[PDB]
């Protein structure tokens, strides 16, 4: 399985780097109630 | 309750007039467990009960 290990390892690395550049630091803004430091979200929703 | 957006959380039992005639005055002493196991959700609850 050595030859497949190499492949999978290099796949993750490549995608990891592409991911890096592509969306590095683009996920730091969320909706907030005005003035407060609380996150605004519906019921069964995850902060996004 | 819901016709404005402020909602009353008034309980008769809680009231001071109700309490003085409920019972006799008292020397209490709140004893709290602060061992490691309490830390967590439970520790949070105790500070609000006392």
């Amino acid at each position: 399985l050595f030859h497949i290990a190499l492949l999978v390892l290099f796949m993750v690395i490549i995608y990891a780097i592409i991911g890096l550049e592509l969306f590095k630091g683009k996920m730091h803004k969320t909706c907030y109630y005005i003035g407060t430091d609380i996150v605004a979200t519906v019921e069964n929703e995850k902060p996004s | 309750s819901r016709t404005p957006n402020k909602i009353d959380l008034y309980d008769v039992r809680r009231r001071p007039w109700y309490i003085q005639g409920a019972a006799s005055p008292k020397d209490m002493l709140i004893l709290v467990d602060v061992s490691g196991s309490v830390s967590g959700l439970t520790l949070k609850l105790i500070r609000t009960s006392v």
Binding site: G35, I38 | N5, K6, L9
Partner: protein, 49 residues
């Protein structure tokens, strides 16, 4: 000297950064317990009285 406003304790500190705008916290329930030696200027000849 006694007044309708509740008797206050401490310097009031509320954090504006952590009050979400529409939830309605409790207002007050304390009794208005002003003392005679706090409604008037204290003497030693008034603590006797």
């Amino acid at each position: 000297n006694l007044q309708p406003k509740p008797i206050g304790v401490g310097i009031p500190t509320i954090n504006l950064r952590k009050r979400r705008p529409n939830v309605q916290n409790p207002k007050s329930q304390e009794p208005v317990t002003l003392d005679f030696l706090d409604a008037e200027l204290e003497n030693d000849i008034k603590v006797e009285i």
